Structure of Major capsid protein:
Amino acid sequence: LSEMVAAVSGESVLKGVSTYTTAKGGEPVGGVFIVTDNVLRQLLTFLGE
Amino acid sequence: LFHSFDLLVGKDAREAGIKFEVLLGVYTNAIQYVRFLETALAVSCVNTEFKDLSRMTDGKIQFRISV
Amino acid sequence: SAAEGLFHSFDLLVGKDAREAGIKFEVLLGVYTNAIQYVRFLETALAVSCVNTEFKDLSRMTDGKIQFRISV
Amino acid sequence: VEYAEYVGAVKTVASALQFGVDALERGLINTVLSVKLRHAPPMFILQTLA
């Protein structure tokens, strides 16, 4: 997953303010992972928290 | 500057914004907007506003020619 | 064309106070993005690996010298 | 329209100024790292000579 984030998040034009902050820490959300339900049910156990 | 270019590009002026690039010149056409009272063949036809053609269903009219 | 990717804000009408025709000159504005990260030499961790001096006239010097005298 | 030209030239000149300065800073860090690399013996020699 971190290799995917490093392979995607690079140079991009037309930037702005820190959009889509969370609630707990308040950090910006870097990306989103669209997945199916089986891999969603798995990847909250391989990660756990 | 006549438009709404603020939230597309962002808030900062050093990273982003707008800038003049090219001064282009094209030629718009002018068309003569004629009207019926402005032209001269409204002399031959006296024109009144009947405002509903459907009233005269008869296709003929009676002339009372008195000599 | 040269109007293939640009916005335009307004026009320049040539002295026509009540006409919309003629030669029109439009300001074809452009968007620009300065994709840069402001790095300094003293802002990276490489600056621990050097001791840096602001020497304002280094083009005037032609050679440098430091003498080390080792007392064995 | 001349005011649209004037800030359009200011935003080009100050940009080329801050793209000549940061180009020089990246040149500085590049030549510092190349100086460090020119005085860099490998590890498999300094393993024994040090």
In short: Helices of chain B lie at 6-9. The first helix of chain B runs from residue 6 to 9.
